[PDB]
Amino acid sequence: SPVHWKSAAEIVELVKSKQISPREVVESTIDLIEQRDPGLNAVVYKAYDEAREKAAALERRIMQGEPVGMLAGVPTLMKDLFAAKPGWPSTLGGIRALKDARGAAGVWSTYPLKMSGEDSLLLGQTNSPVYGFRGTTDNTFFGPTRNPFNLDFNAGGSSGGAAALVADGIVPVAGGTDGGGSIRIPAAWTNTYGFQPSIGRVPFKSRPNAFHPGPYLYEGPITRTVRDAALAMNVLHGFDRRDPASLRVKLDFTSALAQGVRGKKIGLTLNYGVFPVQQEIQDLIGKAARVFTELGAHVEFVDLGIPYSQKQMSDAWCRMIAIPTVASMQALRKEGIDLYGEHRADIPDALMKWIDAVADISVQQISADQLLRTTVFDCMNGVFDRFDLLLAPTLACMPVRNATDGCTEGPSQINGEEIDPLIGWCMTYLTNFSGHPSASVPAGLIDGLPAGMLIIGDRQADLDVIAASAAFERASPWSQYYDIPAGRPL
């Protein structure tokens, strides 16, 4: 393949130097999708002709020496979860009743808008669970997205299709979204790098309600290298007055790649003091943390002092996500697509539980969840009063086997302790409460399957996260593990 396993940085250079045409990037990427995605089931919409049209125009500009963007020719796909791209479908993660929906003119979600703006070529959309409402990717319309490291296992979610394509070498970057961890969750299970930016760093368009009661929501890249994520972040970040958290600051994410972590004070937790975490994952993260001590950082265990139980926190997260989910369902019903009645079967029972639970949620309950969130935020802040970075395992458990009923979920217990199977083991959700930037870095394999370590920075310290990530990438590479998917039978 001229493009399998190439980085975005490599493709940009190949295209800019006229070694390969944008047309050939598109056809070769299509070949990889057609050849390799049947097992993975990561792609849910193919926009091949659009990509061909865009490639022809990009090729003409390159040949005539007209201006081209900073990701010119890099192939990518966006995520099918509140997707907005004019003329494209949006099924909210595999809701069959929405299969005929198409995006209205002039309405865009951030990843397709900004990536295409800098001449990345959008090839289609990737699979998500229904309404994003779990850390696995499966639904009853498209089915499960499978792990390139072992197709009997799930890629994770909700951005599972994004991570699976990147982990299988098919595109160098894919768009994820994250309300409880979903840029980072599937990255951790697929040996890819998932970057969740600070709140306000990348615009997020929530309409009709910009002041919704949910957790912080983010769009961001999943890549195989930290450099590619920095390149994507240079495109994705930036002021937009229509996002009421937007930061009016310009950064160069690539400037942090060579910075190192010498002298940094790093806090370490294996379970945030409140989650049950598989011992093998704890051990792997203890080892990974020591990579930083060899690079001149000082690492020590910290106690966040979170006074809520992990069930209390996951229940609050579910209610916070459920409120705008109910608003979506109510609006769709008004528009003639009724997911409460006629098309009830399209919603998982576990999700309908929360849908019903918040239908008449009291202001007292809303307030209690807000107090919980504040407490978690302040526990994070207590760490960053004294430390430059916090390390933790991204997730409390290893990948799960795919179900056969379209409802793959996580474990309901870890170490004998009950845990919410949709999101409870996704320890990432703490930064959707708190707003801190974080990235999942591949920490190694356990019994042949990937596990991630989360690097968290202080509020707005995205470049510190990039610097630590790149330092770890140099000292403890994970690229060799791609040999597993690279050699899998097709």
Q: Which sequence spans correspond to the domains of the chain? A: 1-490
Closest of 196, 132, 82, 93 to residue 422, by C-alpha: 132
- State the structure-solving technique: X-ray
What Å distances lie between residue 103 and 106, 107, 163, CA to CA? 9, 7, 24
Helices 310-334 and 349-358 meet at what angle, rounded to 10?
90
For tokens 């933790």, the residue is: 392
- Amino acid letter, residue 299: V
Residue 360 CB: number of other CB atoms within 10 A? 7
Q: Which two tokens stand for residue 474?
A: 């140099």
Instruction: List the resolution, Å.
Output: 1.7
Beta pairing, strands 438-446 & 150-154: unpaired
Those residues with Cβ within 8 angstroms of residue 162's Cβ, 6 or more apart along the chain or in another chain: 42, 77, 79, 126, 174, 175, 176, 186, 222
What letter does residue 120 receive in the DSSP assignment? Answer: P
Burial class (CB in 10 A: 0-12, 13-18, 19+), 134: buried
Cα(first)–Cα(last) distance of the chain, in Å? 15
Residue 164: its H or E element: helix 160-167
Chain centroid to CA 334: how far? 31
CB–CB of 399/465 below 8 Å?
no
Q: How far apart are CA 116 and CA 111, in angstroms?
A: 8
Residue 241: its H or E element: none
For tokens 């929906």, the residue is: 101
- Amino acid letter, residue 302: V
CATH of domain 1-490: 3.90.1300.10
Q: Would you put residue 283 in left (φ > 0), alpha (ψ -120 to 50) or beta?
A: alpha
How many secondary structure helices (H) and strands (E) does the chain include? 14, 15
What letter does residue 198 receive in the DSSP assignment? Answer: P
Q: How far apart are CA 302 and CA 95, in angstroms?
A: 42
Burial class (CB in 10 A: 0-12, 13-18, 19+), 209: exposed
- Cis amide bond preceding 328, omega within 30: no
Q: Which two tokens stand for residue 43?
A: 């792609």
Q: How many CA atoms lie within 13 A of 172 on its CB side?
A: 25
What letter does residue 219 receive in the DSSP assignment? Answer: E
